[PDB]
Design an enzyme around this catalytic site. Sequence first.
Site, mmCIF file in Angstrom:
data_model
loop_
_atom_site.group_PDB
_atom_site.id
_atom_site.type_symbol
_atom_site.label_atom_id
_atom_site.label_comp_id
_atom_site.label_asym_id
_atom_site.label_seq_id
_atom_site.Cartn_x
_atom_site.Cartn_y
_atom_site.Cartn_z
ATOM 1 N N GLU A 115 0.835 -1.255 -0.048
ATOM 2 C CA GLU A 115 -0.086 -0.036 -0.051
ATOM 3 C C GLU A 115 0.727 1.174 0.160
ATOM 4 O O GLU A 115 0.646 2.451 -0.783
ATOM 5 C CB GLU A 115 -0.759 0.247 1.261
ATOM 6 N N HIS A 124 2.091 -1.510 -10.097
ATOM 7 C CA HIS A 124 1.906 -2.941 -10.134
ATOM 8 C C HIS A 124 2.780 -3.434 -10.819
ATOM 9 O O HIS A 124 2.746 -3.701 -11.926
ATOM 10 C CB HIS A 124 0.265 -3.124 -10.495
HETATM 11 C C1 NGH Z 1 1.195 -7.322 -0.409
HETATM 12 O O1 NGH Z 1 -0.133 -7.395 0.159
HETATM 13 C C2 NGH Z 1 -1.245 -7.731 -0.686
HETATM 14 C C3 NGH Z 1 -2.137 -8.384 0.291
HETATM 15 C C4 NGH Z 1 -3.258 -8.712 -0.634
HETATM 16 C C5 NGH Z 1 -3.536 -8.749 -1.666
HETATM 17 S S1 NGH Z 1 -5.094 -9.261 -2.331
HETATM 18 O O2 NGH Z 1 -4.582 -10.224 -3.655
HETATM 19 O O3 NGH Z 1 -6.056 -9.706 -1.574
HETATM 20 N N1 NGH Z 1 -5.882 -7.634 -3.003
HETATM 21 C C6 NGH Z 1 -5.663 -6.200 -2.272
HETATM 22 C C7 NGH Z 1 -4.634 -5.500 -2.665
HETATM 23 O O4 NGH Z 1 -3.868 -5.735 -3.851
HETATM 24 N N2 NGH Z 1 -4.189 -4.457 -1.977
HETATM 25 O O5 NGH Z 1 -3.312 -3.494 -2.254
HETATM 26 C C8 NGH Z 1 -6.262 -7.514 -4.329
HETATM 27 C C9 NGH Z 1 -7.440 -8.728 -4.752
HETATM 28 C C10 NGH Z 1 -8.470 -7.520 -5.889
HETATM 29 C C11 NGH Z 1 -7.140 -9.584 -5.506
HETATM 30 C C12 NGH Z 1 -2.455 -7.994 -2.572
HETATM 31 C C13 NGH Z 1 -1.214 -7.507 -2.003
HETATM 32 ZN ZN ZN Z 2 -2.579 -3.107 -5.450
#
Ligand code: NGH
Ligand code: ZN
Length: 159
Positions: A115, A124
Amino acid sequence: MGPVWRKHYITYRINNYTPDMNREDVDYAIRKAFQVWSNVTPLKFSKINTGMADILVVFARGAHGDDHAFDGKGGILAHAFGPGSGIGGDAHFDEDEFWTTHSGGTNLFLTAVHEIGHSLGLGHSSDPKAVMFPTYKYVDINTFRLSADDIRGIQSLYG
Ligand SMILES: COc1ccc(S(=O)(=O)N(CC(=O)NO)CC(C)C)cc1
Ligand SMILES: [Zn+2]
Ligand SMILES: [Ca+2]
Ligand SMILES: [Ca+2]
Ligand SMILES: [Ca+2]
Ligand SMILES: [Zn+2]
């Protein structure tokens, strides 16, 4: 005469703190998460609880008008944006969840690195070793580093 800058100082503030743990740890996770990138990028993060910050860390719990606002123990972890207007800069996290300093569960520090990546404005990534990626992986804090693919991405931020 000669105005110039390129971030330098990322001033940030948290809106509220997960009571799930001791606040010290809460800001510690997000602090360290910033710090990781702040080490590699020339950005200099700074938390200030007392004043006005550039960005804002929105920990909200199953609330706020959005499409995918927040949700319980699972679903969305967190969402944030760098290069945009208004919300752009600022970073929102699923306070609804019970984040944990320890790896077991959802590690705040872990998600936070991603984040915080959003807030700095990193694109990304598309490699499971990167932390900026849209995917998730149980990264070991023993290693505490960013991937090469990630590092080119972050250096893309001229500021
Ligand atoms: C590095 O920490 C992360 C935790 C969860 C996800 S997630 O895949 O659960 N997700 C949330 C996210 O990307 N937040 O930045 C997207 C989901 C829509 C697949 C991605 C990154
Ligand atoms: Zn993201
Ligand atoms: Ca959630
Ligand atoms: Ca903003
Ligand atoms: Ca919580
Ligand atoms: Zn939102």
